[PDB]
Symmetry: D2
Subunit: 105 residues, 4 copies
Protein backbone atom coordinates (compact mmCIF):
# COMPACT_ATOMS: atom_id res chain seq x y z
CA UNK A 1 0.00 0.00 0.00
CA UNK A 2 3.07 2.23 0.23
CA UNK A 3 2.99 3.79 -3.23
CA UNK A 4 -0.82 3.91 -3.20
CA UNK A 5 -0.96 6.13 -0.10
CA UNK A 6 2.28 7.89 -1.02
CA UNK A 7 0.80 9.14 -4.29
CA UNK A 8 -2.36 10.34 -2.54
CA UNK A 9 -0.34 12.12 0.15
CA UNK A 10 1.62 13.87 -2.59
CA UNK A 11 -1.57 14.93 -4.36
CA UNK A 12 -3.14 16.42 -1.24
CA UNK A 13 0.03 18.10 -0.04
CA UNK A 14 0.30 19.44 -3.58
CA UNK A 15 -3.29 20.66 -3.48
CA UNK A 16 -2.43 22.35 -0.20
CA UNK A 17 0.57 24.07 -1.80
CA UNK A 18 -1.60 25.38 -4.62
CA UNK A 19 -4.21 26.76 -2.23
CA UNK A 20 -1.44 28.32 -0.13
CA UNK A 21 -0.15 30.12 -3.22
CA UNK A 22 -3.64 31.50 -3.75
CA UNK A 23 -3.98 32.36 -0.07
CA UNK A 24 -0.66 34.22 -0.08
CA UNK A 25 -1.56 36.06 -3.29
CA UNK A 26 -4.76 37.20 -1.57
CA UNK A 27 -2.98 38.35 1.59
CA UNK A 28 -0.13 40.09 -0.23
CA UNK A 29 -2.55 42.15 -2.33
CA UNK A 30 0.50 42.99 -4.41
CA UNK A 31 0.33 44.45 -7.93
CA UNK A 32 1.99 42.34 -10.62
CA UNK A 33 2.47 39.26 -8.44
CA UNK A 34 -0.01 37.00 -10.25
CA UNK A 35 2.59 35.07 -12.26
CA UNK A 36 4.94 34.65 -9.29
CA UNK A 37 2.28 32.95 -7.18
CA UNK A 38 1.17 30.84 -10.16
CA UNK A 39 4.74 29.65 -10.55
CA UNK A 40 5.44 29.24 -6.84
CA UNK A 41 2.26 27.23 -6.33
CA UNK A 42 3.08 24.80 -9.13
CA UNK A 43 6.73 24.66 -8.06
CA UNK A 44 5.72 23.79 -4.49
CA UNK A 45 3.24 21.09 -5.50
CA UNK A 46 5.62 19.58 -8.07
CA UNK A 47 8.29 19.25 -5.38
CA UNK A 48 5.99 16.88 -3.49
CA UNK A 49 6.21 14.31 -6.28
CA UNK A 50 4.12 12.89 -9.15
CA UNK A 51 1.04 13.20 -6.96
CA UNK A 52 1.84 16.89 -6.60
CA UNK A 53 2.51 17.46 -10.29
CA UNK A 54 -0.88 15.85 -10.97
CA UNK A 55 -2.65 18.09 -8.45
CA UNK A 56 -0.95 21.23 -9.79
CA UNK A 57 -2.13 20.50 -13.33
CA UNK A 58 -5.73 19.92 -12.26
CA UNK A 59 -5.88 22.98 -10.02
CA UNK A 60 -4.16 25.31 -12.49
CA UNK A 61 -6.73 24.27 -15.08
CA UNK A 62 -9.57 24.85 -12.64
CA UNK A 63 -8.22 28.27 -11.68
CA UNK A 64 -7.96 29.28 -15.33
CA UNK A 65 -11.58 28.20 -15.71
CA UNK A 66 -12.77 30.32 -12.79
CA UNK A 67 -10.55 33.27 -13.71
CA UNK A 68 -12.22 33.73 -17.11
CA UNK A 69 -15.69 33.17 -15.68
CA UNK A 70 -14.93 36.49 -13.97
CA UNK A 71 -13.58 38.08 -17.15
CA UNK A 72 -9.92 37.09 -17.52
CA UNK A 73 -8.70 37.76 -21.07
CA UNK A 74 -7.72 34.78 -23.22
CA UNK A 75 -4.20 36.11 -23.82
CA UNK A 76 -3.74 36.75 -20.10
CA UNK A 77 -4.60 33.14 -19.29
CA UNK A 78 -1.97 31.91 -21.76
CA UNK A 79 0.67 34.00 -20.00
CA UNK A 80 -0.53 32.43 -16.76
CA UNK A 81 -0.17 28.89 -18.13
CA UNK A 82 3.41 29.77 -19.05
CA UNK A 83 4.01 30.66 -15.40
CA UNK A 84 2.21 27.53 -14.20
CA UNK A 85 4.29 25.21 -16.33
CA UNK A 86 7.49 27.17 -15.69
CA UNK A 87 7.18 26.41 -11.97
CA UNK A 88 5.71 22.94 -12.42
CA UNK A 89 8.76 22.11 -14.53
CA UNK A 90 10.79 23.06 -11.46
CA UNK A 91 12.29 26.29 -12.80
CA UNK A 92 12.86 29.09 -10.28
CA UNK A 93 9.56 30.86 -9.52
CA UNK A 94 11.52 33.98 -8.49
CA UNK A 95 11.83 34.58 -12.24
CA UNK A 96 8.41 36.24 -11.95
CA UNK A 97 8.99 38.02 -8.63
CA UNK A 98 7.84 41.67 -8.74
CA UNK A 99 10.26 44.12 -7.13
CA UNK A 100 9.67 44.45 -3.40
CA UNK A 101 7.41 41.49 -2.68
CA UNK A 102 7.97 40.64 1.01
CA UNK A 103 10.35 37.72 1.62
CA UNK A 104 7.77 35.57 3.42
CA UNK A 105 6.14 35.11 0.01
CA UNK B 1 -9.65 24.27 1.08
CA UNK B 2 -6.61 24.34 3.35
CA UNK B 3 -8.11 22.28 6.18
CA UNK B 4 -9.87 19.99 3.70
CA UNK B 5 -6.62 18.97 1.98
CA UNK B 6 -4.70 19.01 5.27
CA UNK B 7 -6.99 16.47 6.90
CA UNK B 8 -6.79 14.23 3.83
CA UNK B 9 -3.03 14.66 3.65
CA UNK B 10 -2.90 13.68 7.32
CA UNK B 11 -5.06 10.60 6.82
CA UNK B 12 -2.83 9.34 4.01
CA UNK B 13 0.47 10.14 5.71
CA UNK B 14 -0.87 8.24 8.71
CA UNK B 15 -1.98 5.35 6.50
CA UNK B 16 1.54 5.23 5.10
CA UNK B 17 2.84 5.24 8.67
CA UNK B 18 0.64 2.30 9.61
CA UNK B 19 1.72 0.32 6.55
CA UNK B 20 5.35 1.15 7.29
CA UNK B 21 4.96 -0.38 10.76
CA UNK B 22 3.63 -3.57 9.18
CA UNK B 23 6.44 -3.70 6.62
CA UNK B 24 9.02 -3.07 9.33
CA UNK B 25 7.40 -5.80 11.42
CA UNK B 26 7.60 -8.24 8.52
CA UNK B 27 11.21 -7.35 7.72
CA UNK B 28 12.44 -7.36 11.31
CA UNK B 29 10.99 -10.84 11.82
CA UNK B 30 11.60 -10.34 15.52
CA UNK B 31 9.69 -12.55 17.95
CA UNK B 32 7.89 -10.46 20.56
CA UNK B 33 8.06 -7.13 18.72
CA UNK B 34 4.35 -7.22 17.86
CA UNK B 35 3.22 -4.71 20.46
CA UNK B 36 6.05 -2.28 19.70
CA UNK B 37 5.16 -2.06 16.01
CA UNK B 38 1.46 -1.62 16.80
CA UNK B 39 2.21 1.24 19.17
CA UNK B 40 4.79 2.75 16.82
CA UNK B 41 2.48 2.65 13.81
CA UNK B 42 -0.32 4.34 15.74
CA UNK B 43 2.05 6.82 17.36
CA UNK B 44 3.56 7.83 14.02
CA UNK B 45 0.14 8.22 12.40
CA UNK B 46 -1.37 10.19 15.29
CA UNK B 47 1.61 12.53 15.14
CA UNK B 48 0.42 13.65 11.70
CA UNK B 49 -2.71 15.24 13.13
CA UNK B 50 -6.48 14.56 13.36
CA UNK B 51 -6.43 12.79 9.99
CA UNK B 52 -3.70 10.43 11.13
CA UNK B 53 -5.58 9.56 14.30
CA UNK B 54 -8.60 8.73 12.16
CA UNK B 55 -6.58 6.52 9.81
CA UNK B 56 -4.73 4.82 12.67
CA UNK B 57 -8.10 3.75 14.09
CA UNK B 58 -9.52 2.52 10.79
CA UNK B 59 -6.38 0.56 9.97
CA UNK B 60 -5.99 -0.87 13.48
CA UNK B 61 -9.60 -2.06 13.25
CA UNK B 62 -8.86 -3.52 9.82
CA UNK B 63 -5.69 -5.26 10.99
CA UNK B 64 -7.55 -6.80 13.93
CA UNK B 65 -10.17 -8.11 11.50
CA UNK B 66 -7.50 -9.64 9.24
CA UNK B 67 -5.54 -11.28 12.06
CA UNK B 68 -8.68 -12.88 13.45
CA UNK B 69 -9.53 -14.28 10.03
CA UNK B 70 -6.17 -16.04 10.21
CA UNK B 71 -6.79 -17.46 13.69
CA UNK B 72 -5.55 -14.71 16.02
CA UNK B 73 -6.73 -15.23 19.60
CA UNK B 74 -9.40 -13.06 21.21
CA UNK B 75 -7.14 -12.29 24.16
CA UNK B 76 -4.11 -11.56 21.99
CA UNK B 77 -6.34 -9.13 20.12
CA UNK B 78 -7.29 -7.21 23.27
CA UNK B 79 -3.59 -6.85 24.08
CA UNK B 80 -3.00 -5.53 20.55
CA UNK B 81 -5.69 -2.88 21.03
CA UNK B 82 -4.04 -1.73 24.26
CA UNK B 83 -0.82 -1.23 22.32
CA UNK B 84 -2.68 0.52 19.51
CA UNK B 85 -4.29 3.01 21.88
CA UNK B 86 -1.05 3.54 23.81
CA UNK B 87 0.73 4.82 20.73
CA UNK B 88 -2.30 6.59 19.28
CA UNK B 89 -2.63 8.70 22.44
CA UNK B 90 0.98 9.84 22.22
CA UNK B 91 2.62 7.48 24.71
CA UNK B 92 6.13 6.29 23.89
CA UNK B 93 6.05 3.08 21.81
CA UNK B 94 9.56 2.28 23.05
CA UNK B 95 7.80 1.23 26.25
CA UNK B 96 7.15 -2.03 24.40
CA UNK B 97 10.49 -2.14 22.58
CA UNK B 98 12.42 -5.39 22.95
CA UNK B 99 16.03 -4.63 23.81
CA UNK B 100 18.18 -5.51 20.84
CA UNK B 101 15.49 -4.81 18.29
CA UNK B 102 17.64 -3.14 15.62
CA UNK B 103 17.65 0.64 16.15
CA UNK B 104 16.36 1.23 12.62
CA UNK B 105 12.97 0.07 13.93
CA UNK C 1 -11.75 -0.23 5.95
CA UNK C 2 -15.33 -0.06 4.66
CA UNK C 3 -16.38 3.11 6.49
CA UNK C 4 -12.93 4.60 5.92
CA UNK C 5 -13.13 4.29 2.12
CA UNK C 6 -16.86 5.06 2.18
CA UNK C 7 -16.45 8.42 3.90
CA UNK C 8 -13.68 9.19 1.41
CA UNK C 9 -15.79 8.08 -1.54
CA UNK C 10 -18.57 10.32 -0.24
CA UNK C 11 -16.27 13.32 0.14
CA UNK C 12 -15.18 12.96 -3.47
CA UNK C 13 -18.59 12.28 -4.98
CA UNK C 14 -19.70 15.41 -3.12
CA UNK C 15 -16.73 17.41 -4.39
CA UNK C 16 -17.74 16.29 -7.87
CA UNK C 17 -21.32 17.42 -7.22
CA UNK C 18 -20.23 20.86 -6.03
CA UNK C 19 -18.05 21.23 -9.13
CA UNK C 20 -20.87 20.03 -11.39
CA UNK C 21 -23.07 22.77 -9.93
CA UNK C 22 -20.43 25.34 -10.82
CA UNK C 23 -19.95 23.92 -14.32
CA UNK C 24 -23.71 23.97 -14.89
CA UNK C 25 -24.02 27.48 -13.47
CA UNK C 26 -21.33 28.73 -15.85
CA UNK C 27 -22.86 26.88 -18.79
CA UNK C 28 -26.39 28.05 -18.01
CA UNK C 29 -25.27 31.69 -17.91
CA UNK C 30 -28.64 32.50 -16.38
CA UNK C 31 -29.24 35.67 -14.39
CA UNK C 32 -30.44 35.09 -10.83
CA UNK C 33 -29.86 31.34 -10.83
CA UNK C 34 -26.74 31.23 -8.67
CA UNK C 35 -28.78 30.71 -5.49
CA UNK C 36 -30.37 27.65 -7.09
CA UNK C 37 -26.99 26.25 -8.08
CA UNK C 38 -25.48 26.78 -4.62
CA UNK C 39 -28.41 24.93 -3.07
CA UNK C 40 -28.33 22.17 -5.70
CA UNK C 41 -24.61 21.52 -5.37
CA UNK C 42 -24.86 21.37 -1.58
CA UNK C 43 -27.97 19.21 -1.80
CA UNK C 44 -26.41 16.70 -4.20
CA UNK C 45 -23.23 16.45 -2.14
CA UNK C 46 -25.03 16.04 1.18
CA UNK C 47 -27.12 13.29 -0.41
CA UNK C 48 -23.91 11.26 -0.74
CA UNK C 49 -23.53 10.89 3.02
CA UNK C 50 -21.49 12.47 5.87
CA UNK C 51 -18.47 12.72 3.56
CA UNK C 52 -20.43 14.79 1.06
CA UNK C 53 -21.78 17.10 3.75
CA UNK C 54 -18.19 17.66 4.78
CA UNK C 55 -16.91 18.34 1.25
CA UNK C 56 -19.88 20.64 0.57
CA UNK C 57 -19.02 22.83 3.56
CA UNK C 58 -15.34 23.00 2.65
CA UNK C 59 -16.07 23.96 -0.95
CA UNK C 60 -18.82 26.45 -0.12
CA UNK C 61 -16.26 28.14 2.13
CA UNK C 62 -13.74 27.96 -0.71
CA UNK C 63 -16.20 29.39 -3.22
CA UNK C 64 -17.12 32.28 -0.92
CA UNK C 65 -13.45 33.07 -0.41
CA UNK C 66 -12.86 33.19 -4.17
CA UNK C 67 -15.94 35.25 -5.10
CA UNK C 68 -15.06 37.79 -2.41
CA UNK C 69 -11.59 38.06 -3.95
CA UNK C 70 -13.31 39.09 -7.19
CA UNK C 71 -15.62 41.68 -5.59
CA UNK C 72 -18.68 39.79 -4.33
CA UNK C 73 -21.02 41.89 -2.17
CA UNK C 74 -21.51 41.31 1.57
CA UNK C 75 -25.29 40.80 1.54
CA UNK C 76 -25.03 38.53 -1.50
CA UNK C 77 -22.44 36.45 0.35
CA UNK C 78 -24.76 36.03 3.34
CA UNK C 79 -27.57 35.12 0.94
CA UNK C 80 -25.24 32.59 -0.71
CA UNK C 81 -24.48 31.02 2.66
CA UNK C 82 -28.22 30.77 3.25
CA UNK C 83 -28.69 28.91 -0.03
CA UNK C 84 -25.77 26.62 0.83
CA UNK C 85 -27.22 25.63 4.20
CA UNK C 86 -30.71 25.22 2.73
CA UNK C 87 -29.48 22.65 0.23
CA UNK C 88 -27.04 20.95 2.59
CA UNK C 89 -29.86 20.21 5.06
CA UNK C 90 -32.05 18.32 2.58
CA UNK C 91 -34.40 21.15 1.69
CA UNK C 92 -35.46 21.34 -1.96
CA UNK C 93 -33.13 23.47 -4.12
CA UNK C 94 -35.97 24.04 -6.61
CA UNK C 95 -37.26 26.58 -4.10
CA UNK C 96 -34.76 28.98 -5.66
CA UNK C 97 -35.24 27.76 -9.22
CA UNK C 98 -35.82 30.51 -11.75
CA UNK C 99 -38.89 29.45 -13.69
CA UNK C 100 -37.48 29.23 -17.19
CA UNK C 101 -34.22 27.66 -16.11
CA UNK C 102 -33.72 24.79 -18.60
CA UNK C 103 -34.87 21.42 -17.21
CA UNK C 104 -31.39 19.88 -17.59
CA UNK C 105 -30.30 22.04 -14.65
CA UNK D 1 -11.61 19.59 -11.08
CA UNK D 2 -14.04 16.98 -12.40
CA UNK D 3 -11.52 14.35 -13.55
CA UNK D 4 -9.36 14.97 -10.47
CA UNK D 5 -12.17 14.16 -8.03
CA UNK D 6 -13.50 11.57 -10.47
CA UNK D 7 -10.29 9.53 -10.37
CA UNK D 8 -10.21 9.78 -6.58
CA UNK D 9 -13.82 8.67 -6.23
CA UNK D 10 -13.14 5.68 -8.48
CA UNK D 11 -10.13 4.60 -6.40
CA UNK D 12 -12.09 4.76 -3.14
CA UNK D 13 -15.15 3.01 -4.51
CA UNK D 14 -12.66 0.53 -5.95
CA UNK D 15 -11.01 0.14 -2.56
CA UNK D 16 -14.45 -0.34 -1.02
CA UNK D 17 -15.26 -3.03 -3.60
CA UNK D 18 -12.07 -4.90 -2.76
CA UNK D 19 -12.81 -4.82 0.96
CA UNK D 20 -16.33 -6.10 0.37
CA UNK D 21 -14.94 -9.04 -1.59
CA UNK D 22 -12.92 -9.86 1.52
CA UNK D 23 -15.90 -9.30 3.83
CA UNK D 24 -18.08 -11.57 1.70
CA UNK D 25 -15.34 -14.22 1.72
CA UNK D 26 -15.19 -14.04 5.51
CA UNK D 27 -18.98 -14.33 5.83
CA UNK D 28 -19.42 -17.13 3.29
CA UNK D 29 -16.82 -19.30 5.05
CA UNK D 30 -16.93 -21.39 1.89
CA UNK D 31 -14.31 -23.93 0.80
CA UNK D 32 -12.76 -23.30 -2.62
CA UNK D 33 -14.19 -19.81 -3.06
CA UNK D 34 -10.92 -17.89 -2.61
CA UNK D 35 -10.32 -17.36 -6.32
CA UNK D 36 -13.90 -16.28 -7.01
CA UNK D 37 -13.74 -13.41 -4.52
CA UNK D 38 -10.30 -12.32 -5.72
CA UNK D 39 -11.76 -12.19 -9.21
CA UNK D 40 -15.03 -10.53 -8.19
CA UNK D 41 -13.32 -7.88 -6.08
CA UNK D 42 -10.95 -6.88 -8.88
CA UNK D 43 -13.82 -7.02 -11.36
CA UNK D 44 -16.00 -4.77 -9.20
CA UNK D 45 -13.21 -2.24 -8.65
CA UNK D 46 -12.16 -2.26 -12.31
CA UNK D 47 -15.76 -1.46 -13.23
CA UNK D 48 -15.51 1.89 -11.42
CA UNK D 49 -12.96 3.03 -13.99
CA UNK D 50 -9.19 3.74 -14.16
CA UNK D 51 -8.99 4.84 -10.52
CA UNK D 52 -10.58 1.55 -9.53
CA UNK D 53 -8.18 -0.56 -11.58
CA UNK D 54 -5.41 1.30 -9.76
CA UNK D 55 -6.85 0.58 -6.30
CA UNK D 56 -7.42 -3.09 -7.18
CA UNK D 57 -3.81 -3.66 -8.21
CA UNK D 58 -2.48 -2.00 -5.09
CA UNK D 59 -4.80 -3.92 -2.79
CA UNK D 60 -4.23 -7.31 -4.45
CA UNK D 61 -0.47 -6.86 -4.04
CA UNK D 62 -1.06 -5.99 -0.39
CA UNK D 63 -3.36 -8.95 0.12
CA UNK D 64 -0.77 -11.33 -1.31
CA UNK D 65 1.87 -9.77 0.93
CA UNK D 66 -0.26 -10.39 4.01
CA UNK D 67 -1.35 -13.90 2.99
CA UNK D 68 2.32 -14.90 2.58
CA UNK D 69 3.08 -13.48 6.02
CA UNK D 70 0.79 -16.13 7.50
CA UNK D 71 2.04 -18.81 5.12
CA UNK D 72 0.55 -19.33 1.67
CA UNK D 73 1.60 -21.83 -0.99
CA UNK D 74 3.51 -20.30 -3.89
CA UNK D 75 1.44 -22.09 -6.55
CA UNK D 76 -1.65 -20.78 -4.77
CA UNK D 77 -0.34 -17.21 -4.77
CA UNK D 78 0.31 -17.49 -8.50
CA UNK D 79 -3.18 -18.92 -8.98
CA UNK D 80 -4.54 -16.01 -6.95
CA UNK D 81 -2.66 -13.54 -9.15
CA UNK D 82 -4.32 -15.12 -12.18
CA UNK D 83 -7.75 -14.68 -10.60
CA UNK D 84 -7.03 -11.06 -9.69
CA UNK D 85 -5.91 -10.23 -13.23
CA UNK D 86 -8.78 -12.21 -14.76
CA UNK D 87 -11.30 -10.09 -12.88
CA UNK D 88 -9.39 -6.83 -13.29
CA UNK D 89 -9.31 -7.35 -17.05
CA UNK D 90 -13.10 -7.55 -17.03
CA UNK D 91 -13.64 -11.28 -17.56
CA UNK D 92 -16.50 -13.08 -15.80
CA UNK D 93 -15.50 -13.79 -12.18
CA UNK D 94 -18.06 -16.62 -12.20
CA UNK D 95 -15.40 -18.55 -14.09
CA UNK D 96 -13.98 -19.29 -10.64
CA UNK D 97 -17.29 -19.87 -8.83
CA UNK D 98 -17.43 -23.05 -6.71
CA UNK D 99 -20.58 -25.15 -6.93
CA UNK D 100 -23.21 -24.06 -4.41
CA UNK D 101 -21.91 -20.63 -3.44
CA UNK D 102 -24.99 -18.64 -2.32
CA UNK D 103 -26.18 -16.39 -5.15
CA UNK D 104 -25.89 -13.31 -2.95
CA UNK D 105 -22.13 -13.56 -3.44
Amino acid sequence: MRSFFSFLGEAFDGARDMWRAYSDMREANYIGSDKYFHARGNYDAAKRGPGGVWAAEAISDARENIQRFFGHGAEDSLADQAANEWGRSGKDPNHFRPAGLPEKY
